[PDB]
Amino acid sequence: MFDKHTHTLIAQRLDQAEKQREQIRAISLDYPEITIEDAYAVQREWVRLKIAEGRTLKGHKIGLTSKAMQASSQISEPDYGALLDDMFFHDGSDIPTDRFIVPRIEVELAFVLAKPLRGPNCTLFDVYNATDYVIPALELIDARCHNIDPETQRPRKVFDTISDNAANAGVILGGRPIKPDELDLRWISALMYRNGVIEETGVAAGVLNHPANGVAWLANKLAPYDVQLEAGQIILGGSFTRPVPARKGDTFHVDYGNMGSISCRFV
């Protein structure tokens, strides 16, 4: 494990990559001895830097939820990253494509907390008690590191993703807010349209068998750092679709059936 100053240097390089919209070499290639603990330490430093610049923490996301993507990576559980205020775009918004590098859209559910959640021993049941509203949410993900020879599996890529604030870039909330007990969250389903054609469909149970499961897991991950999920935070639970590339000119419309819809346009 590296000393903090190494984590800070890597964070500064990610920060410049984001600002210039120019990718850097995969962190795990430049730092072949990097550990998962180092990766989260890099993330923490970068988030710290971005908050010092004037951003505010608004929540978190859980990623790498599919067992398939978990299997091919160096780890055997999901990942997480921090959501900042400048990542949020309004339902129906024009999104500036130029701000991103290789943006892709994911289909998720978000949990808006009424009460804090703290580990250890946080459970699904604690999540239900603490959740004010569940609402559909799109995530816009991106990559500040190059991915060389993408067809060749390289498990240590997960360290890059984690360092790179779990690929965070954007969030679009929309549709129908519900109390968590209103209906069975496992069977919420969605159709993702891009430019008027369905590109992906999915069902929420594809996220960790229950789309709220990652929230409890996250609270438990954060506990050792003396961090909790705070009241008012928005927690994105994970995607039940493969991400779909967003290009300038694209319009997205994601239909969650009786849970409403979310739209945006890339300009």
Residues in touch with Mg ion (CB under 5 A) = 63, 106, 139, 239
Which is nearer to Mg ion, 7 or 84 (by Cβ)? 84
| Cα(194)–Cα(175) distance, integer angstroms | 17
Which is nearer to Mg ion, 63 or 119 (by Cβ)? 63
49 binds, among Mg ion, a copy of itself, none (CB under 5 to 8 A by kind): none
- The least CB distance from residue 170 to a copy of itself, in Å, is 14
Q: Print the binding letters for residues 225-254 with a copy of itself: x by CB under 8 A, - otherwise.
A: -------x-------x--------x-xxx-
| Cα(67)–Cα(78) distance, integer angstroms | 9
Length of the chain: 267
96 binds a copy of itself (CB under 8 A): no
- The least CB distance from residue 148 to a copy of itself, in Å, is 12
| Cα(45)–Cα(4) distance, integer angstroms | 8
174 binds, among Mg ion, a copy of itself, none (CB under 5 to 8 A by kind): a copy of itself
**C-alpha count within 13 angstroms, C-beta hemisphere, residue 154:** 17
97 binds a copy of itself (CB under 8 A): no
CB within 8 Å of 22: residues ≥ 6 apart: 16, 101
Is the separation of the CB atoms in 18 and 87 below 8 Å?
Answer: no
- Residue ranges for the known binding site are 106, 108, 139
- The least CB distance from residue 141 to a copy of itself, in Å, is 19
196 binds a copy of itself (CB under 8 A): yes
Give the interface with a copy of itself as residue ranges (CB under 8 A): 66-68, 91-93, 112, 121, 123-125, 128-129, 132-133, 135, 173-179, 181-182, 184, 186-187, 189-191, 193, 195-203, 205-206, 209-210, 232, 240, 249, 251-253, 255, 257-258, 260-261, 263-265
